[PDB]
Amino acid sequence: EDESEALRQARKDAELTASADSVRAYLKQIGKVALLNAEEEVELAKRIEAGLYATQLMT
DNA sequence: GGTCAGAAAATCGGTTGTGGTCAGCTGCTGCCACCGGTTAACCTCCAATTCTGCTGCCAGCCT
């Protein structure tokens, strides 16, 4: 019953905590988003350039 | 053996004359102090006691 069940319960209980230090709170806040790779960075950059040209052209 | 023009003193003050003298910028010119931008192998989660009041918590009569 220790196969991520009680671990999940303690994970949600730790997620609903306070964590009264600001550095620890910022690290816990930034730990949620997952990492990337080269093709994902390429497609994000292409979307950035397309959106920037779209708003420039529309203005 | 006496009255009137001239000469000779500082004195208060205007001229004046130039002889520097100091500053007042004035470029200006070099420079130097300061602000802003840029760098493309990869490597992605911290360093004692004493007293009073308040709040959170669990059994437990009452509905």
PDB file of C-alpha atoms (C1' of nucleotides) in Angstrom:
ATOM      1  CA  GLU A   1       0.000   0.000   0.000  1.00  0.00           C
ATOM      2  CA  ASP A   2       3.134   2.173  -0.095  1.00  0.00           C
ATOM      3  CA  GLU A   3       3.177   2.148  -3.930  1.00  0.00           C
ATOM      4  CA  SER A   4       2.489   5.894  -4.319  1.00  0.00           C
ATOM      5  CA  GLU A   5      -0.785   5.752  -2.339  1.00  0.00           C
ATOM      6  CA  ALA A   6       0.420   6.994   1.050  1.00  0.00           C
ATOM      7  CA  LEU A   7       3.135   8.840  -0.881  1.00  0.00           C
ATOM      8  CA  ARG A   8       0.396  10.590  -2.882  1.00  0.00           C
ATOM      9  CA  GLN A   9      -1.533  11.406   0.304  1.00  0.00           C
ATOM     10  CA  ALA A  10       1.572  12.886   1.935  1.00  0.00           C
ATOM     11  CA  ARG A  11       2.362  14.688  -1.338  1.00  0.00           C
ATOM     12  CA  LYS A  12      -1.025  16.435  -1.340  1.00  0.00           C
ATOM     13  CA  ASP A  13      -0.672  17.188   2.384  1.00  0.00           C
ATOM     14  CA  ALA A  14       2.753  18.718   1.709  1.00  0.00           C
ATOM     15  CA  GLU A  15       1.318  20.634  -1.251  1.00  0.00           C
ATOM     16  CA  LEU A  16      -1.311  22.237   0.997  1.00  0.00           C
ATOM     17  CA  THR A  17       1.299  23.385   3.553  1.00  0.00           C
ATOM     18  CA  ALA A  18       2.514  26.908   4.379  1.00  0.00           C
ATOM     19  CA  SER A  19       6.318  26.900   3.740  1.00  0.00           C
ATOM     20  CA  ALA A  20       6.906  30.245   5.487  1.00  0.00           C
ATOM     21  CA  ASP A  21      10.334  31.018   3.849  1.00  0.00           C
ATOM     22  CA  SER A  22      10.194  33.051   0.652  1.00  0.00           C
ATOM     23  CA  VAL A  23      13.160  31.337  -1.027  1.00  0.00           C
ATOM     24  CA  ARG A  24      11.645  27.910  -0.338  1.00  0.00           C
ATOM     25  CA  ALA A  25       8.260  29.127  -1.578  1.00  0.00           C
ATOM     26  CA  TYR A  26       9.780  30.403  -4.822  1.00  0.00           C
ATOM     27  CA  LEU A  27      11.686  27.157  -5.400  1.00  0.00           C
ATOM     28  CA  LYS A  28       8.530  25.116  -4.776  1.00  0.00           C
ATOM     29  CA  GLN A  29       6.639  27.418  -7.144  1.00  0.00           C
ATOM     30  CA  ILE A  30       9.175  27.069  -9.970  1.00  0.00           C
ATOM     31  CA  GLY A  31       9.598  23.320  -9.548  1.00  0.00           C
ATOM     32  CA  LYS A  32       6.213  22.552 -11.120  1.00  0.00           C
ATOM     33  CA  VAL A  33       6.932  23.355 -14.775  1.00  0.00           C
ATOM     34  CA  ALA A  34       8.781  20.636 -16.679  1.00  0.00           C
ATOM     35  CA  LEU A  35      11.920  21.049 -18.777  1.00  0.00           C
ATOM     36  CA  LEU A  36      12.251  21.266 -22.560  1.00  0.00           C
ATOM     37  CA  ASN A  37      14.409  20.237 -25.522  1.00  0.00           C
ATOM     38  CA  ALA A  38      15.734  21.689 -28.770  1.00  0.00           C
ATOM     39  CA  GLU A  39      12.736  21.117 -31.061  1.00  0.00           C
ATOM     40  CA  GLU A  40      10.360  22.481 -28.421  1.00  0.00           C
ATOM     41  CA  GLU A  41      12.533  25.589 -28.092  1.00  0.00           C
ATOM     42  CA  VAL A  42      12.546  25.926 -31.898  1.00  0.00           C
ATOM     43  CA  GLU A  43       8.761  25.766 -32.170  1.00  0.00           C
ATOM     44  CA  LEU A  44       8.285  28.177 -29.241  1.00  0.00           C
ATOM     45  CA  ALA A  45      10.661  30.640 -30.921  1.00  0.00           C
ATOM     46  CA  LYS A  46       8.811  30.287 -34.235  1.00  0.00           C
ATOM     47  CA  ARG A  47       5.500  30.998 -32.503  1.00  0.00           C
ATOM     48  CA  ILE A  48       7.053  34.038 -30.776  1.00  0.00           C
ATOM     49  CA  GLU A  49       8.281  35.467 -34.083  1.00  0.00           C
ATOM     50  CA  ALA A  50       4.967  34.747 -35.825  1.00  0.00           C
ATOM     51  CA  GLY A  51       2.968  36.429 -33.058  1.00  0.00           C
ATOM     52  CA  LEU A  52       5.273  39.451 -32.969  1.00  0.00           C
ATOM     53  CA  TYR A  53       4.984  39.934 -36.725  1.00  0.00           C
ATOM     54  CA  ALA A  54       1.211  39.440 -36.492  1.00  0.00           C
ATOM     55  CA  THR A  55       0.730  42.171 -33.893  1.00  0.00           C
ATOM     56  CA  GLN A  56       3.168  44.491 -35.713  1.00  0.00           C
ATOM     57  CA  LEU A  57       1.299  43.980 -38.993  1.00  0.00           C
ATOM     58  CA  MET A  58      -2.119  44.427 -37.376  1.00  0.00           C
ATOM     59  CA  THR A  59      -1.058  47.641 -35.624  1.00  0.00           C
TER      60      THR A  59
ATOM     61  C1'  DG B   1      52.801 155.586   6.332  1.00  0.00           C
ATOM     62  C1'  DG B   2      47.978 152.716   4.919  1.00  0.00           C
ATOM     63  C1'  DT B   3      44.974 150.085   0.625  1.00  0.00           C
ATOM     64  C1'  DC B   4      44.901 146.995  -3.301  1.00  0.00           C
ATOM     65  C1'  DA B   5      46.771 143.306  -7.049  1.00  0.00           C
ATOM     66  C1'  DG B   6      49.889 139.054  -7.022  1.00  0.00           C
ATOM     67  C1'  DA B   7      52.287 134.979  -5.001  1.00  0.00           C
ATOM     68  C1'  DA B   8      52.314 131.249  -2.313  1.00  0.00           C
ATOM     69  C1'  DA B   9      50.701 127.728   1.051  1.00  0.00           C
ATOM     70  C1'  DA B  10      47.594 123.380   1.909  1.00  0.00           C
ATOM     71  C1'  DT B  11      42.711 121.559   0.710  1.00  0.00           C
ATOM     72  C1'  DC B  12      38.683 119.379  -1.367  1.00  0.00           C
ATOM     73  C1'  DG B  13      37.942 117.672  -5.396  1.00  0.00           C
ATOM     74  C1'  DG B  14      37.640 116.589 -10.685  1.00  0.00           C
ATOM     75  C1'  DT B  15      40.641 114.769 -14.631  1.00  0.00           C
ATOM     76  C1'  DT B  16      43.171 111.689 -16.522  1.00  0.00           C
ATOM     77  C1'  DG B  17      46.135 108.547 -17.969  1.00  0.00           C
ATOM     78  C1'  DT B  18      47.908 104.784 -18.604  1.00  0.00           C
ATOM     79  C1'  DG B  19      49.749 100.640 -16.538  1.00  0.00           C
ATOM     80  C1'  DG B  20      49.001  96.821 -15.283  1.00  0.00           C
ATOM     81  C1'  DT B  21      45.655  93.393 -13.192  1.00  0.00           C
ATOM     82  C1'  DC B  22      42.458  90.132 -12.350  1.00  0.00           C
ATOM     83  C1'  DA B  23      38.636  87.806 -13.703  1.00  0.00           C
ATOM     84  C1'  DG B  24      34.891  86.454 -16.849  1.00  0.00           C
ATOM     85  C1'  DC B  25      33.972  83.881 -19.597  1.00  0.00           C
ATOM     86  C1'  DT B  26      34.838  81.567 -24.291  1.00  0.00           C
ATOM     87  C1'  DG B  27      36.132  78.487 -27.252  1.00  0.00           C
ATOM     88  C1'  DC B  28      38.022  74.599 -27.503  1.00  0.00           C
ATOM     89  C1'  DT B  29      40.456  70.896 -27.312  1.00  0.00           C
ATOM     90  C1'  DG B  30      41.887  67.062 -25.647  1.00  0.00           C
ATOM     91  C1'  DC B  31      40.659  63.712 -22.566  1.00  0.00           C
ATOM     92  C1'  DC B  32      38.428  61.068 -19.098  1.00  0.00           C
ATOM     93  C1'  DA B  33      34.567  59.445 -16.611  1.00  0.00           C
ATOM     94  C1'  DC B  34      30.425  57.248 -17.114  1.00  0.00           C
ATOM     95  C1'  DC B  35      26.486  54.766 -19.190  1.00  0.00           C
ATOM     96  C1'  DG B  36      24.706  51.332 -22.398  1.00  0.00           C
ATOM     97  C1'  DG B  37      24.975  47.145 -25.425  1.00  0.00           C
ATOM     98  C1'  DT B  38      27.174  42.355 -26.533  1.00  0.00           C
ATOM     99  C1'  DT B  39      29.644  37.407 -26.007  1.00  0.00           C
ATOM    100  C1'  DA B  40      26.187  31.317 -29.706  1.00  0.00           C
ATOM    101  C1'  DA B  41      30.235  23.494 -27.833  1.00  0.00           C
ATOM    102  C1'  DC B  42      27.749  22.174 -23.236  1.00  0.00           C
ATOM    103  C1'  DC B  43      26.276  22.047 -17.656  1.00  0.00           C
ATOM    104  C1'  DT B  44      18.095  23.596 -15.701  1.00  0.00           C
ATOM    105  C1'  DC B  45      15.181  23.511  -8.142  1.00  0.00           C
ATOM    106  C1'  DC B  46      18.497  26.975  -1.290  1.00  0.00           C
ATOM    107  C1'  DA B  47      22.800  28.308   4.195  1.00  0.00           C
ATOM    108  C1'  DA B  48      16.624  31.155  30.681  1.00  0.00           C
ATOM    109  C1'  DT B  49      12.719  31.803  33.453  1.00  0.00           C
ATOM    110  C1'  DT B  50       8.024  33.788  34.583  1.00  0.00           C
ATOM    111  C1'  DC B  51       3.572  35.285  33.372  1.00  0.00           C
ATOM    112  C1'  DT B  52      -0.474  36.257  30.297  1.00  0.00           C
ATOM    113  C1'  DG B  53      -3.265  35.675  26.671  1.00  0.00           C
ATOM    114  C1'  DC B  54      -4.726  33.070  22.232  1.00  0.00           C
ATOM    115  C1'  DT B  55      -5.881  29.226  19.454  1.00  0.00           C
ATOM    116  C1'  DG B  56      -6.260  24.612  18.270  1.00  0.00           C
ATOM    117  C1'  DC B  57      -8.202  20.032  19.838  1.00  0.00           C
ATOM    118  C1'  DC B  58     -10.619  16.086  21.606  1.00  0.00           C
ATOM    119  C1'  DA B  59     -14.163  13.725  24.762  1.00  0.00           C
ATOM    120  C1'  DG B  60     -18.914  14.050  25.585  1.00  0.00           C
ATOM    121  C1'  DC B  61     -24.147  15.414  27.208  1.00  0.00           C
ATOM    122  C1'  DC B  62     -27.856  17.207  24.229  1.00  0.00           C
ATOM    123  C1'  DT B  63     -30.744  17.720  20.535  1.00  0.00           C
TER     124       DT B  63
END
